[PDB]
């Protein structure tokens with residue numbers, strides 16, 4: 001329509017949160033989304049919410065197609081709620097269409113009927129990531145291969161599942177589909193399995209997946225993909241494997257090519273990420289970038305923290321930055337889920353500091369036996385001089401909530417004794433930390 | 442023999458104290474009453490067997506299969522707790538019912554041989570016992586059990602009757618309702634969960650009533666009898682018939698068979714041993730940890746009782762029960778209600794300027810992932826201090842989020858720390874980002 005004070009390109013976590021925050025503050029906000037099936041962002045329709053809903057159903061060995069529609073019931077519900085939480089505000093114009101830069105102030109919104117041109121004093125890039133297609137001849141043509149999004153729309157369960165890549169998201173589908181009763185083949189082009197984790201953990205994670213029917217093929221370079229008999233045929237040299245479905249889990253790159261950021265002076269790196277400082281500023285004046293287009297850690301909470309820094313600049317209270325980020329936690333959602341904070345044993349032993357590595361098997365946690373899943377391990381690293389914890393690797397059920405307890409103490413600089421001498425709930429898995437830091441000597 | 446330390450009972454504090462004193466070089470001797478009580482009340486009757494059944498109920502698993510899986514996890518952990526005690530050569534876990542004859546010695550009435558043990562320091566850990574109100578017929582009526590008997594039932598009852606709206610009665614009411622059995626709670630009070638917020642108890646009630654649980658307040662239970670295949674609870678001008686009856690009347694400390702006057706410990710009213718801050722006994726070299734203190738009946742409190750005694754015997758200085766601040770608790774219904782600190786009425790009565798924030802669980806996306814959007818989130822912030830005085834977490838995995846809440850109040854940090862904290866996603870703990878964003 002007219003000029004906007006705030007224009008945000010994309011319905012991601014940071015964008016939709018900044019939208020109401022500025023609309024509540026009185027700004028004339030306009031959010032542009034390129035697909036009417038992704039209101040709410042990648043987390044709700046593609047990534048976190050749909051996959052985690054399928055995993056939980058797979059934990060109970062639920063029928064696959066019955067669980068897929070239960071995923072559609074939650075996503076279609078939360079997509080409409082996230083759209084109406086913006087559209088029902090008079091200060092917000094949820095414009096549909098694909099945005100493209102012309103100026104540092106003007107944009108072109110592509111819609112099939114006709115284009116629009118939107119102006120903004122402060123524009124905010126938040127377009128997320130896109131699937132990385134490896135340069136393997138035959139993926140774009142073979143009808144049986146799938147992306148992460150394309151896999152979450154299968155009509156029924158495939159018997160044999162091939163995964164391209166040994167990344168974190170790939171292992172999530174490897175454990176999810178195995179729990180659905182399906183032979184999963186993982187294919188990573190690396191010598192070690194999960195090279196960014198301790199081999200103690202990487203081994204233990206691999207034995208869990210092996211017993212549920214997931215074989216791990218390492219240092220594999222596939223050369224061509226085709227369909228020869230109603231099955232996706234992946235063809236390596238002197239090694240050929242057929243699957244009823246193939247999933248690409250080779251990573252996600254920042255989606256900026258279709259945005260053409262060079263016109264607004266916005267610079268990008270080789271992967272396509274918009275260059276950004278500590279205050280979420282790009283090369284262009286009065287234009288920000290939040291989310292996976294930063295090229296940083298692709299987590300929903302990392303994107304929401306980007307909103308925190310942006311909000312603390314436009315609405316006052318001083319200014320914060322990405323430099324405030326330390327001991328960032330993450331978790332990979334298999335069963336049992338692996339949650340991680342701080343450093344690894346290999347990082348601590350290399351540093352040279354006097355450390356003490358404590359290990360507690362999950363089978364020694366009575367609550368883990370209450371939940372009928374005693375698999376996993378618990379490992380933590382303690383600095384012997386400062387008494388603080390440098391890291392942890394919690395491989396157990398409900399590790400995604402215990403990880404935030406150890407993460408809180410590490411940022412508070414408190415010693416390991418805090419978690420050891422702490423009154424927890426019973427029976428629980430937070431109290432598992434009571435026994436883990438008792439092994440310290 | 443001549444033992445430097447003697448612990449009466451296999452409870453959580455004495456189980457850990459015996460293995461701790463062993464690693465220090467003490468001659469420890471733990472006396473245990475029953476053969477089926479290794480590891481204590483928690484392993485065999487308490488938290489572990491009950492919430493093992495609660496996990497299986499939310500899946501609506503066949504009832505007789507859940508009892509079997511319980512009977513095999515209570516068997517594993519019982520064997521272990523004996524192993525960790527017998528693996529230490531310094532410990533001699535003696536079986537028998539111990540009895541006090543004087544300060545420095547004990548007699549255990551055991552069939553193998555009645556035998557007298559002297560100890561340098563005696564640590565009472567006999568736990569608690571379920572006492573039952575003197576209702577006529579509760580003596581000898583078929584189909585009437587307490588928490589222990591109800592755990593070993595053959596097949597699921599058609600209609601279960603609960604005498605008591607207490608926390609342990611609500612756990613069994615939710616657990617048995619999820620198995621397909623109609624539950625009837627008979628509460629003698631005008632209130633449902635009187636120690637709870639008016640906000641919280643109504644949600645718990647609606648959640649229970651939606652699963653076919655009838656919370657009958659002001660229940661006049663006069664006599665109990667048995668007639669025609671069923672237990673009949675005589676009432677006011679009528680009587681109601683249930684297939685099985687659970688007693689949820691609270692547990693009294695187990696200080697009776699000890700005959701503890703011979704040692705000289707002053708027993709209070711309710712039978713609990715009188716105890717100071719360092720858990721000291723009126724006898725100079727006796728101690729009492731666990732439920733015999735008369736305090737909160739939690740397994741995690743007994744472990745803290747252990748830490749207090751360990752800090753006294755081998756620890757530097759002394760640490761007291763006055764350090765215990767913001768003790769949390771969780772009722773393991775579905776969804777579990779976990780709570781720390783004060784409620785809205787306790788905060789309003791204290792005379793502080795408070796603000797109440799409430800986030801329904803339907804707004805937590807992780808609740809949809811777990812297929813349980815029931816419950817409510819509630820916390821109270823003090824405007825004078827910007828701190829949190831209490832939180833009511835009625836949701837799935839609430840027994841794990843409340844520990845994050847308690848540690849912030851323990852270290853005593855402002856509410857803005859949980860509001861701006863980077864939590865994992867998707868998870869339940871991250872709703873604290875949204876809960877404390879409602880504070881103005």
Ligand SMILES: Cc1cc2nc3c(=O)[nH]c(=O)nc-3n(C[C@H](O)[C@H](O)[C@H](O)COP(=O)(O)OP(=O)(O)OC[C@H]3O[C@@H](n4cnc5c(N)ncnc54)[C@H](O)[C@@H]3O)c2cc1C
Nearest residue numbers: 010011012013041042043047099127128291292298300303
């Ligand atoms: C399979 C999978 C699983 C994941 N699991 C987890 C997990 O368990 N935990 C976790 O923390 N994170 C997880 N993530 C990551 C998480 O989904 C994202 O990193 C997070 O949502 C960040 O999104 P964003 O804020 O960058 O915006 P996004 O939601 O990623 O995207 C912004 C929006 O911009 C739109 N857009 C793109 N290009 C244009 C254009 N040219 N014009 C207009 N609009 C455009 C997109 O359509 C999108 O709606 C997962 C991701 C995937 C793919």
Ligand SMILES: Cc1cc2nc3c(=O)[nH]c(=O)nc-3n(C[C@H](O)[C@H](O)[C@H](O)COP(=O)(O)OP(=O)(O)OC[C@H]3O[C@@H](n4cnc5c(N)ncnc54)[C@H](O)[C@@H]3O)c2cc1C
Nearest residue numbers: 450452453474478481482487539567568731732739740743
């Ligand atoms: C149904 C139920 C559910 C519960 N749920 C929870 C929960 O969710 N969370 C929680 O925190 N707590 C819970 N509790 C409470 C918890 O089980 C106990 O309060 C806790 O274990 C107390 O431990 P303790 O240190 O007092 O030792 P106890 O375990 O109570 O010690 C008792 C032991 O002493 C022995 N003994 C007694 N008298 C003698 C004697 N004269 N000679 C020798 N040995 C003797 C007994 O045989 C027994 O082995 C629950 C309790 C029950 C009954």
Ligand SMILES: [Cl-]
Nearest residue numbers: 167168169251
């Ligand atoms: Cl990855």
Ligand SMILES: [Cu+2]
Nearest residue numbers: 013043044806
């Ligand atoms: Cu979200």
Ligand SMILES: [Cu+2]
Nearest residue numbers: 059060061179
């Ligand atoms: Cu299984």
Ligand SMILES: [Cu+2]
Nearest residue numbers: 080081083084
């Ligand atoms: Cu609508």
Ligand SMILES: [Cu+2]
Nearest residue numbers: 104105121286
């Ligand atoms: Cu300008």
Ligand SMILES: [Cu+2]
Nearest residue numbers: 138139140141
């Ligand atoms: Cu091709």
Ligand SMILES: [Cu+2]
Nearest residue numbers: 160183242243
């Ligand atoms: Cu096959």
Ligand SMILES: [Cu+2]
Nearest residue numbers: 136221222223
């Ligand atoms: Cu090649």
Ligand SMILES: [Cu+2]
Nearest residue numbers: 143227228230
């Ligand atoms: Cu074909």
Ligand SMILES: [Cu+2]
Nearest residue numbers: 236237238239
């Ligand atoms: Cu060759």
Ligand SMILES: [Cu+2]
Nearest residue numbers: 257258259260
């Ligand atoms: Cu283009």
Ligand SMILES: [Cu+2]
Nearest residue numbers: 277279281282
């Ligand atoms: Cu700048």
Ligand SMILES: [Cu+2]
Nearest residue numbers: 325326327328
């Ligand atoms: Cu870090």
Ligand SMILES: [Cu+2]
Nearest residue numbers: 059371372496
């Ligand atoms: Cu489970």
